[PDB]
């Protein structure tokens, strides 16, 4: 059917389905695209957490996108708290890095992929994770 | 062709790999079985791991099985260290109870993906992860 096994061929039905809305929010038709938003967005967003928050947001995750979001992590690092919505951009940007220019405008990779977030994972782990951003950051997420 | 993401089919693939070097290490044709062994094993393995520990070894795991890797991790829990391999065994035994006994044999589940373990991952990761584990456990690799 697509990996001969019940739980991969349904890891990979959610995946699609978030990388699906993070297209339609993308406005975008590039699978490729929603996939290096997706992945530059949540790395940036797991490198503000501690050890223990970091868990906590991956157990919301399907178990592929689980594998994506613990890509490259360095869980010796202190939390990285940068106030400013530059700083944060810079650090998806960063993941966004092509021979010419992001691959995606960074606010509107961060906006598309923390709306996809907030409406897959449960309302209590998306208040913990908002109860831990500044002001300008929160003001990336559609609850403002 | 299979996801619509090179990404996704390139990590399916070395995850079908890993799976079928466990089914003919088990000697079984059930690709389930294999699977329960390998989240099975993985998880009693990394629960003897520090944080920094986990992590590195998720270096050395597919993006997809990283995911299965860190299914259900409790990072604030202090890393178990049972000197015997009836205490590793049983922990292993754990994720493979079944309405009727164990799913596998955990003995031949453990040592059916440390042999694949050992043959996929850097020679510097896999002697790094004997160096942390107790001599009756060690056994339980190829190494000895």
Same mark, same amino acid.
């Given at each position: 059917?697509?990996?001969?096994?019940? /739980?991969? #061929? =349904?890891?990979?039905?959610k995946t699609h389905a978030w990388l699906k809305a993070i297209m339609e929010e993308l406005g975008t038709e590039d699978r490729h695209k929603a996939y290096l938003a997706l992945r530059?967005?949540?790395?940036?967003?797991? #490198? =503000?957490?501690? /050890? @223990? @928050?970091?868990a906590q947001l991956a157990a919301q995750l399907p178990m592929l996108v689980r594998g994506?979001?613990? @890509?490259?992590? #360095?869980?010796?690092?202190k939390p990285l708290k940068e106030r400013h919505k @530059?700083?944060?951009?810079a650090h998806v940007a960063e993941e966004l890095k092509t021979p010419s220019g992001p691959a995606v405008d960074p606010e509107a990779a961060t906006r598309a992929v923390f709306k996809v977030l907030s409406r897959e994972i449960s309302q209590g782990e998306l208040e913990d /994770?908002?109860?831990?951003?500044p002001k300008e950051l929160r003001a990336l997420w559609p609850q403002g």
């Open positions: 059917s697509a990996t001969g096994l019940e /739980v991969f #061929d =349904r890891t990979l039905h530059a967005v949540l790395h940036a967003l797991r #490198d =503000r957490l501690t /050890v @223990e @928050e970091v994506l979001y613990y @890509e490259g992590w #360095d869980p010796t690092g @530059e700083a944060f951009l /994770v908002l109860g831990l951003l």
